[PDB]
Design a protein around this ligand. Structure first.
Ligand SMILES: [Cl-]
Ligand SMILES: [Cl-]
Lengths: 30, 30, 30, 30
């Protein structure tokens, strides 16, 4: 699955984009 | 869980933001 | 002209979108 | 000044972010 994350993607994931949610920027990670 | 969706959120969800990935815009739905 | 603004658009402007810049969200105002 | 551009920033500028408006993605160039 993919996840919007703060502060960063985790081990085993790659950043594929960005989420805008709750007034913050998130890494989009899969 | 929240989900990035095209074309729109499904009944029972609301749009709380936006995902940007693979050069495309997605609704962020929870 | 249009401007990316924090915290908000100003008098005489309308918000038409969002900017992502310097780790922050900005109102896109014209 | 910074500018939202399609297709890309012009020589002498760099891309520092992204604009979202009118349902479209733009390079944010300064
Ligand atoms: Cl923080
Ligand atoms: Cl602040």
């Amino acid at each position: 699955a993919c996840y919007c994350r703060i502060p960063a993607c985790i081990a085993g994931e790659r950043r594929y984009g960005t989420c805008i949610y709750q007034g913050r920027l998130w890494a989009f990670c899969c």
